Amino acid sequence: SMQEEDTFRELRIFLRNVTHRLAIDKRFRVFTKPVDPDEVPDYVTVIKQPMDLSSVISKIDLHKYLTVKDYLRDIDLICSNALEYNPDRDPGDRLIRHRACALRDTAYAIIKEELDEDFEQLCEEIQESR
Ligand SMILES: Cc1cc2cccc(NCCN(C)C)c2[nH]c1=O
């Protein structure tokens, strides 16, 4: 229906806003674009499901997220990928892991403060009906 289409449109608007706020944070610059294979050729080898904030925006616009829960799975993926690819004790690796966890924590905190639980439940019930 139109009302359900309106619901998913509000979801996309909400998700773009959250993603924009993550993307403009200087700590998260490394997560804003896909990894350049010329600079890092072994990334595609090690990480089977690459994810970044530009790709999240593309997925929002392609209507790939019908719930905030599905969006958070991609946020979690950005974080888990970073933990996986940068596991060493070296400061470079520890910095990116800390930033990855901060990105995840920040996304969840924004959602906790600004997502109405009943809006998410409506999205989930529309999703499950299809
Ligand atoms: C998303 C991402 C981008 C990136 C770019 C350059 C270099 C690294 N890794 C640091 C090198 N260490 C893994 C040894 C990178 N690690 C990442 O996790």
Side-chain angles (χ1 to χ4, degrees):
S1 70
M2 194 207 73
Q3 304 93 59
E4 293 176 348
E5 287 172 13
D6 287 354
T7 299
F8 290 132
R9 186 160 186 273
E10 174 165 354
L11 175 63
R12 293 192 295 273
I13 292 163
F14 174 74
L15 296 179
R16 283 189 203 99
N17 176 262
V18 177
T19 309
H20 178 74
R21 287 150 70 188
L22 297 175
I24 72 186
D25 193 311
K26 289 177 181 173
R27 294 176 295 171
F28 310 146
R29 180 194 265 180
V30 66
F31 310 119
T32 57
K33 294 285 169 192
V35 177
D36 181 34
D38 301 324
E39 291 165 3
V40 184
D42 68 294
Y43 193 85
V44 170
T45 299
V46 180
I47 299 302
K48 299 315 189 182
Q49 200 170 9
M51 189 53 57
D52 67 275
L53 300 171
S54 293
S55 299
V56 171
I57 289 295
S58 295
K59 290 181 65 164
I60 291 168
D61 290 348
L62 290 165
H63 301 195
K64 297 292 192 189
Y65 303 122
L66 295 198
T67 68
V68 177
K69 196 165 105 160
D70 290 342
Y71 169 89
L72 285 171
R73 295 213 203 89
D74 277 352
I75 296 305
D76 287 341
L77 185 55
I78 292 171
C79 180
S80 59
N81 286 349
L83 299 195
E84 181 176 347
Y85 188 74
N86 314 273
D88 297 0
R89 65 139 306 272
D90 304 59
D93 280 28
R94 277 178 179 167
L95 178 54
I96 192 164
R97 289 204 304 276
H98 188 270
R99 286 167 167 177
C101 287
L103 172 78
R104 182 161 183 278
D105 290 350
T106 299
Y108 276 84
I110 290 166
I111 287 173
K112 185 179 184 178
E113 286 203 302
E114 305 179 27
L115 178 61
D116 188 300
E117 286 170 25
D118 292 332
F119 180 83
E120 174 64 0
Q121 189 62 33
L122 180 57
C123 288
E124 290 186 11
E125 288 176 13
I126 296 168
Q127 187 188 48
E128 287 168 14
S129 74
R130 303 189 172 185

